[PDB]
């Protein structure tokens, strides 16, 4: 299986520096081109740089030349992007991809992407509050419950239910940016009304930028 | 640099329809054009390369063609899982450049939302803020109007909405609206109500609670 895995994305101040890695497996980067491509609200999908690790030839987008450098270590089957003099407009998901692998003249494998946030704001971990099921969240014999993940920065935060075992009926809403500059989101799940009180429901929240991991049990309220 | 112009920006069609999306290069790119799919929360996935060749594992209902500098991606029988954004990309000259994308949505029958409301949690109330959440579950089409009322006074400027992308199996949407108050303001009023207008409902639906009720 061909795989590319980016790492190193995170919050960085304007003018600061960050280094991304792209670990390849299932093929040798000596046989392909390796590209970095980013994706942002402002510019969409935007090619950043490429390298041919066999001969070290590199090319760069005009908007990053001099500030970013691409490189590869064939002995670790890994490519890198050094990012200096960072600007707000560099905020993006950074993907690495291969081109020419198996003779296919397109980017046929892309990593999951790593988010880079260029901002002067500080990291903040979220508060996790239950959205308890009640007489106001049930109808037709099913009930909705959830978790409110409030006031964090930067993205990303992840939410699962019952350690990933509960996936059916889950809606994890897209994050919203509050006027405070902090993000918030809710995750809800619909379940049988008859399971409330017998089946445990826990939302597993992870905000890696703050090393915040919260497992919150959600149950009906007392009275 | 070469510009890639995609059209339409949005296309909405029923399951089983044939859909066509287009991409124009600002100058000759020969056949050096690929098409990518991006599903919700995913990375771009290669569909077509060299204008017309199907990438391994991609369903046969995807096809591509070229006419001069005009490129087409066709899905012959739209499936619910084809709900995604689609991007063309030229690799004829450096920099490789991407189109701005076409969003493909699934048309389906109207479905009214299930409407639910959640008071602020006692945990949150221990702090100084109150979040009230209105939930609209599994509806279609996407258009919906959610209004908040506190002691019957229409609220404005103190709520935010978030909407899921189309569900991969049933093609519905869900929406949350969150009303944010100070704890002091929340404890000053009694009746919290979310009113929902949607094409599937014969008239607007109000879901509410009195602060303090179990």
């Amino acid at each position: 299986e061909v795989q590319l895995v980016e790492s190193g994305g995170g919050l960085v101040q304007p003018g600061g520096s960050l280094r991304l890695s792209c670990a390849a497996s299932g093929f040798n980067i000596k046989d392909t081109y390796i590209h970095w491509v980013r994706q942002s609200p402002g510019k969409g999908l935007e090619w950043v740089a490429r390298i041919y690790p066999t001969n070290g030839y590199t090319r760069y987008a005009d908007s990053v030349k001099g500030r970013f450098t691409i490189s590869a270590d064939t002995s670790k089957n890994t490519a890198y992007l050094q990012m200096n003099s960072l600007r707000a407009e560099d905020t993006a998901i950074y993907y690495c991809s291969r081109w020419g692998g198996d003779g296919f003249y397109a980017m046929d494998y892309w990593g999951q992407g790593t988010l880079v946030t260029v901002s002067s704001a500080s990291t903040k971990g979220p508060s996790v509050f239950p959205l308890a099921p009640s007489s106001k969240s049930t109808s037709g014999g099913t009930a909705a419950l959830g978790c409110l993940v409030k006031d964090y920065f930067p993205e990303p935060v992840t939410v699962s239910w019952n350690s990933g075992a509960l996936t059916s009926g889950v809606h994890t809403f897209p994050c919203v940016l509050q006027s405070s500059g902090l993000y918030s989101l809710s995750s809800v799940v619909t379940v049988p009304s008859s399971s409330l009180g017998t089946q445990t429901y826990i939302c597993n929240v992870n905000h890696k930028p703050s090393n915040t991991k919260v497992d919150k049990k959600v149950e009906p309220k007392s009275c | 640099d070469i510009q890639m112009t995609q059209s339409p920006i949005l296309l909405s069609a029923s399951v089983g329809d044939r859909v066509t999306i287009t991409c124009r290069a600002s100058q000759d790119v020969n056949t050096a054009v690929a098409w990518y799919q991006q599903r919700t929360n995913g990375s771009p996935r290669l569909l077509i390369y060299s204008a017309s060749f199907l990438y391994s594992g991609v369903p046969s209902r995807f096809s591509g063609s070229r006419s001069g500098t005009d490129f087409t991606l066709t899905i012959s029988s739209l499936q619910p899982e084809d709900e995604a954004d689609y991007y063309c990309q030229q690799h004829y000259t450096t920099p490789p450049t991407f189109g701005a994308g076409t969003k493909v949505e699934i048309k389906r029958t109207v479905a009214a939302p299930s409407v639910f409301i959640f008071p602020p949690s006692d945990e949150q109330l221990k702090s100084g803020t109150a979040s009230v959440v209105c939930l609209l579950n599994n509806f279609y089409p996407r258009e919906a109007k959610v209004q908040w009322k506190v002691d019957n006074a229409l609220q404005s400027g103190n709520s935010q909405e978030s909407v899921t992308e189309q569900d991969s199996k049933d093609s519905t949407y869900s929406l949350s609206s969150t009303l944010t108050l100070s704890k002091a303001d929340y404890e000053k009023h009694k009746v919290y109500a979310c009113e929902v207008t949607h094409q599937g409902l014969s008239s607007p639906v109000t879901k509410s609670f009195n602060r303090g009720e179990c």
Partner: peptide, 12 residues
């Protein structure tokens, strides 16, 4: 329509 991080989808 522009790209949105939390969905990785184009948004109007």
């Amino acid at each position: 329509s522009q790209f949105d991080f939390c969905t990785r989808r184009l948004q109007s």
